[PDB]
Amino acid sequence: MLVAYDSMTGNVKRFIHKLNMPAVQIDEDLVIDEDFILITYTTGFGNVPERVLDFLERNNEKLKGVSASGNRNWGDMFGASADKISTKYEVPIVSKFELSGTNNDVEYFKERVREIA
Ligand SMILES: Cc1cc2nc3c(=O)[nH]c(=O)nc-3n(C[C@H](O)[C@H](O)[C@H](O)COP(=O)(O)O)c2cc1C
Ligand SMILES: C[As](C)(=O)[O-]
Ligand SMILES: [Zn+2]
Ligand SMILES: [Zn+2]
Ligand SMILES: [Zn+2]
Ligand SMILES: [Zn+2]
């Protein structure tokens, strides 16, 4: 299962390297031609980062689920980028995790993708 991701300060990037799954960094010409899971971080007041919004405008056809990195100090805004993407594109929230994730977060992601794929 291909994982598409973006990371500003490296936490999501660290997480996707722990997964050892096929993974691609988002950019403005990337076109994904296969089912994929998105991993995003959360920015500002519960928001999806602009680069991720731009990518999804072009590539949502094959989106099968979303995970978010965030921080529980945001309370009910924790991982709210995933809530927004799930609600809009009608795909499941695979998982939410803090920062670069724990080993349990890594294993849970993989188990959940195996269920969804
Ligand atoms: C300005 C600011 C706003 C943030 N907004 C949220 C938020 O609304 N919800 C959340 O769960 N985390 C929020 N975060 C936490 C980041 O999503 C978290 O640090 C994430 O691991 C960053 O991923 P990256 O290192 O891959 O860029 C915020 C962080 C910053 C610095
Ligand atoms: C080439 As990579 C897995 O660091 O996005
Ligand atoms: Zn790498
Ligand atoms: Zn834009
Ligand atoms: Zn736009
Ligand atoms: Zn709130």
Determine how many CB atoms are found less than 10 A away from the CB of residue 113.
Answer: 19
Q: How far apart are CA 107 and CA 117, in angstroms?
A: 16
Task: 13-16: list long-range contacts, CB under 8 Å, 24+ apart.
Answer: 14/100, 14/101, 15/39, 15/69, 15/97, 15/100, 15/101, 15/105, 15/106
Q: How far apart are CA 115 and CA 80, in angstroms?
A: 22
Query: Tokens at residue 50, please?
Result: 């602009």
Which experiment gave this structure?
A: X-ray
Q: How far apart are CA 88 and CA 78, in angstroms?
A: 18
Q: Domain 1-117, what fold?
A: Rossmann fold (3.40.50)
Separation in Å, CA 5 to CA 45, 61, 75, 76: 20, 16, 23, 23
Residue nearest to atom 28 of ligand 1 (CA): 43
Q: Using a 6 Å cutoff on CB, does residue 7 contact ligand 1?
A: yes
Distance of CA 102 to the CA centre of its chain: 16
Tell me if residue 102 falls in helix, strand or coil: coil
3, 35 Cβ separation under 8 angstroms? no
Q: What atom in ligand 2 is closest to the CA of residue 17?
A: 3
Q: How far apart are CA 18 and CA 11, in angstroms?
A: 11
Collect all residues with Cβ–Cβ distance below 8 Å to 116 and sequence separation of at least 6: 37, 64, 65, 92, 94
